[PDB]
Amino acid sequence: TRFAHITKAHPCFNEKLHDRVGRVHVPIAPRCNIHCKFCTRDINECERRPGVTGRLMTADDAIKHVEKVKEEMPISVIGVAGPGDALANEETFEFFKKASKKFPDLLKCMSTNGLLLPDRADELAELGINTVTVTVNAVDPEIGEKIYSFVVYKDKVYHGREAFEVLSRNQLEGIEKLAERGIIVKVNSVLIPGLNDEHIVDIAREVKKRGASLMNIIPLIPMGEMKDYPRPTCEQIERVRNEVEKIIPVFRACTQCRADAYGIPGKKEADKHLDMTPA
Ligand code: CLF
């Protein structure tokens, strides 16, 4: 059963552990293959948005960082949320091989946008990765085209609906590939008011078919091209959570943490900027 695989000792699965057990994000994945109309990807030591990091690390330096934080804080997960996409940077794999031997105790976890899941799902299973998160914001191309601008696949660029149809085929087939390989898939969905508002439930039924075990509906952080957009009301994100919960289990404590965040997602720290700022 796919249910016997999904268990909770990870804080981003089961909210009763979120403010209890740690996790570490290594900022080792800077490049990205797609363009989300709400992504901004930055480098600073303040904002808490997911595409933010204080400094990028090398795979070997990330090992030393995990080792150092393990001793000082209570860690249980190692995740590559990385500025861009964790499947699009070979250093994520380079790290996951090194961490498979150096840290056999902490469970491995990583975030992706599915586009490279068909090509790299085989590798993921070989690295002993436990959970992977896929960011699915739409299934209907009429919705999806309004969310993504460009997609890079097979050394070529895609635009509009053509770009979305490549992404949708890869993410959904990527969930089903991962589910078969034994990897527990989580699906993050950003609730964009006016766009996928009345579409989130359709997404939940599609990802359930593909084998996704949990769904994390998160409100939009109006950034990128959608800076003018409104952050959905908390009363509205609970309305979609209560109907989606009837189909697939729902995570309710996502704090949209940055790609360098280490520590318990109740009292976590971030990587300091890097000394190169005088005038
Ligand atoms: S890749 Fe993996 S599942 Fe993602 S955070 Fe990182 S360890 Fe966890 Fe956690 S609170 Fe929400 S769901 Fe994330 S944005 Fe952070």
Ligand code: SF4
């Ligand atoms: S997957 Fe992340 S890095 Fe890539 S476009 Fe979307 S928000 Fe930006």
Ligand SMILES: [S]
């Ligand atoms: S995540």
